[PDB]
């Protein structure tokens, strides 16, 4: 899935981690859209 | 676990939703430590 890959990879490069899959959960909920995930975490 | 309830409630009051359980997941990995959760999301 190039969008899991690129969304998660871009957010790891921004310094987020994925302990316990929290960030994978967030991105899945947000359809792998980085902007929506950033909004949700109030970045 | 009352620590999950209480920490989720405090996070919701800060404007964080828990859509899809991402915030529950984050708080669980952090043992309900709000400082640590905020650090992880770079708040």
UniProtKB/Swiss-Prot annotation, chains A, B:
<comment type="subunit">
    <text>Homooligomer or heterooligomer; may form homotypic arrays. Dimerization interferes with ubiquitin binding. Component of a ternary complex with PAWR and PRKCZ. Forms a complex with JUB/Ajuba, PRKCZ and TRAF6. Identified in a complex with TRAF6 and CYLD. Identified in a heterotrimeric complex with ubiquitin and ZFAND5, where ZFAND5 and SQSTM1 both interact with the same ubiquitin molecule.</text>
</comment>
<feature type="domain" description="UBA">
    <location>
        <begin position="1"/>
        <end position="43"/>
    </location>
</feature>
<comment type="function">
    <text>Molecular adapter required for selective macroautophagy (aggrephagy) by acting as a bridge between polyubiquitinated proteins and autophagosomes. Promotes the recruitment of ubiquitinated cargo proteins to autophagosomes via multiple domains that bridge proteins and organelles in different steps. SQSTM1 first mediates the assembly and removal of ubiquitinated proteins by undergoing liquid-liquid phase separation upon binding to ubiquitinated proteins via its UBA domain, leading to the formation of insoluble cytoplasmic inclusions, known as p62 bodies.</text>
</comment>
<feature type="modified residue" description="Phosphoserine; by ULK1 and TBK1">
    <location>
        <position position="13"/>
    </location>
</feature>
<protein>
    <recommendedName>
        <fullName>Sequestosome-1</fullName>
    </recommendedName>
</protein>
<feature type="cross-link" description="Glycyl lysine isopeptide (Lys-Gly) (interchain with G-Cter in ubiquitin); alternate">
    <location>
        <position position="30"/>
    </location>
</feature>
<feature type="modified residue" description="Phosphoserine; by ULK1">
    <location>
        <position position="17"/>
    </location>
</feature>
<feature type="modified residue" description="N6-acetyllysine; alternate">
    <location>
        <position position="30"/>
    </location>
</feature>
